[PDB]
Every structure is written in structure tokens, then in C-alpha cells.
Amino acid sequence: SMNPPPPETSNPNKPKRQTNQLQYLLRVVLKTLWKHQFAWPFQQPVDAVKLNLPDYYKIIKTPMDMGTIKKRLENNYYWNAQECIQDFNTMFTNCYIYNKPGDDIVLMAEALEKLFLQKINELPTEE
Ligand SMILES: Cc1nnc2n1-c1ccc(Cl)cc1C(c1ccccc1)=NC2
């Protein structure tokens, strides 16, 4: 069995910014989710080999995880907040696509996503 390469977290020719919204996404949104008791399955790419999920990357073609997001934020990979918001949403959606309602991992994603939504509700106006 084989995992795909992870999502990129470095691309020197991609234009980059550090906006106040991006800073909030790191200091508030990412930090809040990362410390949560349910963060651990989301803190790195899905290891389909170790988890014995050989169909995961047959079904999930746009993988995303908070490890990747954390690196992207810390390494100023993004141009805007929407890019990062999309990554979080891709992570949650993938979980729901792959798994079944009421599965433990879905309950975990839902708890994290509730917090995500509460924090992005107060994304600051771009300064
Ligand atoms: C994210 C994600 N999306 N689907 C899966 N995951 C996981 C990723 C990493 C780990 Cl260690 C477990 C799971 C688990 C998992 C299952 C029950 C409780 C905790 C994690 N399920 C497969």
C-alpha cells in the first residue's frame, strides 16, 4: 500500500502575504482547533497505510489536514484568508465524504467545525 505525496506547504514562486485576517487564522482559528481533545486525527495527513484504509485516496482526491494548514500559515504560504478557509472546509468535507454519519471521526470533525465556524464568524475586517 502507498500514500500520496502530501499537499504542498512550500512554493517559493507563489506570491505571499501576511494579512491581519491570516494572522487571526493562525493565532485564533488554528490554535483553537489544534489544542482541542479531538484534534489528533486531523494534525497530519491521513496515513492510509497505517490506518488500513486502502480506498481513502481513491475517494479523497483533495486531501487536507491541520498539519498542512499549520505549515502553510507558519510559512506564509497564502495570499488571502479565503485560501486558508477553503483548506479547513476541504478537511471537514473530506471527513464527511469518506466516513458515515455518527462515526466517531465525524463527531470529532463536527465538534472542530462548530468551533471553526464560531471563530471565522468574527474574522476581522481586512486592515
Ligand atoms: C481525519 C480522518 N478522516 N477519516 C479518518 N481519519 C483519521 C485520521 C487519522 C487517524 Cl489516526 C484516525 C482517523 C480515523 C478515526 C476513527 C475513529 C476515531 C478517531 C479517528 N478515521 C479515518
- The experimental method, as deposited, was X-ray
Alpha-carbon distance of 106 to 24, in angstroms, equals: 26
Residues 123 and 117: their CA atoms lie apart, in Å, by 10
Q: Which residues have C-beta atoms less than 6 Å from ligand 1?
A: 41-42, 46, 51, 95, 98-99, 104-105
CA distances for 10 relative to 23, 39, 51, 61, angstroms: 18, 23, 27, 20
Closest CA to 48 of 112, 8, 94: 94
What is the best residue among 37, 59, 95, 105 to mutate for testing ligand 1's pocket, by most ligand atoms within 8 Å of CB? 105
**H-run or E-run covering 116:** helix 104-120
Q: Give 43: exposed, middle or buried? Use CB within 10 Å, 0-12, 13-18, 19+.
A: middle
Task: Give the number of residues written for the chain.
Answer: 127
Entry resolution (Å): 1.6
Q: Could you give the domains of the chain?
A: 19-123 (1.20.920.10)
Nearest CA to ligand 1 atom 22: 105
CA dihedral 92, 67, 120, 25 (to 10 degrees): -160
Give residue 115's Cα distance to chain centre: 13
Give the integer Cα–Cα distance in Å for 127 and 124: 8
Rounded to 5°, the CA angle 5-8-67 comes to 90
Name the nearest CA neighbour of 72 among 60, 55, 84, 56: 84
